[PDB]
C-alpha cells in the first residue's frame with residue numbers, strides 16, 4: 303500500500319508524538335468522524351519517516367486504536383469514531399500522488415519535526 | 418481525471434447544490450469557466466458492502482461525460498454553474514494528470530449549502 | 538503551442554489580445570531585463586477559445602520576425618529596457634524535460650476583455 | 655532531475671555564493687537540510703547535499719562544474735528524504751548574485 307499523505311521526517315532523537323486531539327493531517331474533504339488514525343515509522347540508518355494511515359487501513363489495519371506497538375503512534379481529533387475507515391483506504395502511487403501533509407497551526411511538534 | 422479531489426458522500430443524501438453554487442474554487446480559471454458537472458463513482462469493499470460514494474467535478478465538455486450538454490438528466494450526474502459562466506466546451510482546462518501532476522483540494526465559497534455527509 | 542515556456546493566455550471574449558507598450562511580458566524572475574521582449578502567437582484548434590502563447594524574441598514559431606513586425610495572430614510585447622536581440626540562450630521548451638511555467642502578469646497589467654491572469 | 659528552476663548563466667562568470675547564502679527557499683524543508691550544490695548542465699540546477707547526479711560527492715569537493723552552498727545551522731548529511739522530483743528558484747531578499755544572474 304501507500305500513505306495518502308507525505309511523510310513527516312524525524313531529525314533529532316525525539317520520536318514522533320502528539321497530544322490528544324492533534325496530529326491528524328488536514329483533509330477538508332473528509333468527515334469529522336474520520337479524523338483518527340496512526341503514524342508508522344519507516345527507517346531505511348537514515349532520517350526516520352513517519353507515514354500517516356487512517357484507522358483500519360495501512361500496514362496495521364487490524365490493530366485497534368491505541369494498540370501499543372513500537373513505530374506506531376495514534377492520533378484522533380475531538381469527535382472521531384472508532385471505526386475502520388474502509389472508504390478511504392490507502393493511496394495508489396500509480397493512480398494518485400501523495401497529499402502534502404499539513405497540520406492545523408497551534409499543533410505541537412517535537413524537536414526535529416517541521417510542517 | 419478530475420482536477421479536484423472528490424466530495425465523498427458520507428450520508429444517504431446525494432450531492433446537490435442550489436443554482437449558482439457548487440463550482441469549485443480555481444484561481445487559474447475565468448468567470449466564463451465556472452460551470453460543470455459532478456459525477457458519482459461508487460465502489461464496494463466486499464468485506465464479509467457499499468462504500469461511501471465519491472463525487473468528482475469535471476468542467477463542461479470535459480471528463481467522462483464530455484459529450485453531455487448542460488442540464489442533461491442522467492443518474493450520477495448533477496450540474497453546477499456560477500452566474501456569468503458561458504455554456505461552451507472548455508478544452509483549455511481539460512482534465513488532469515493524476516499520478517503525474519497534483520490534485521487540487523475541492524474548496525467552495527464560504528456559505529455554500531452542502532448536504533449532509535459532504536465536507537469542504 | 539506547447540513549445541512555449543509559459544502557459545497560454547486564453548481568449549474568452551471577442552477582442553484579440555493586445556498590450557499597451559511596456560506591458561505583456563510574462564513574469565520570469567530568473568531572466569535578465571534585456572530578455573523582457575517577445576511576442577504572443579495565437580493558436581486556434583466548432584471553434585474553441587483562442588489560446589495565446591508567449592515566445593521570447595528570436596524564438597518559437599516566429600523566430601525570424603523582427604520585433605514589431607505585422608502579422609495576424611502575432612502581437613509584440615516588451616518591458617522597459619529590453620534589448621532587440623534574439624534570445625537564443627533561452628529558446629523554446631522541451632515538454633519532455635521541463636514543464637510549462639504558469640503565465641503570470643504584473644499586478645495592474647491592462648488586459649483586454651476576456652483575458653485573466 | 656532537480657527541484658528548483660535553474661539559474662541561467664548570462665556571460666562567462668560562473669555561479670558562486672558567499673558563505674551562508676545560496677540555498678533556494680523551500681518552506682517544505684527543515685533548517686538542517688539547507689545545504690547542497692549547483693550542477694552546470696548554461697544552466698545551474700540546485701541539488702540538496704547527497705541527492706541528484708552528484709550524490710556521492712562530499713560537501714566541499716572541488717570538482718569542475720560544482721559549487722557548494724549552505725545556510726547557517728545546516729547539517730553535513732545526505733538529504734535523501736528530499737530526493738529529486740517545478741519550483742521557482744527563490745533566494746532571500748539581499749542575496750549577493752554574480753554578474754549575469756537574476757532571481
Ligand SMILES: [Zn+2]
Pocket residue numbers: 331332333336389390425427469
Ligand atoms: Zn470520509
Ligand SMILES: [Zn+2]
Pocket residue numbers: 446447450509510547549
Ligand atoms: Zn479559461
Ligand SMILES: [Zn+2]
Pocket residue numbers: 568569572626662664
Ligand atoms: Zn538572459
Ligand SMILES: [Zn+2]
Pocket residue numbers: 311683684687735736
Ligand atoms: Zn528534511
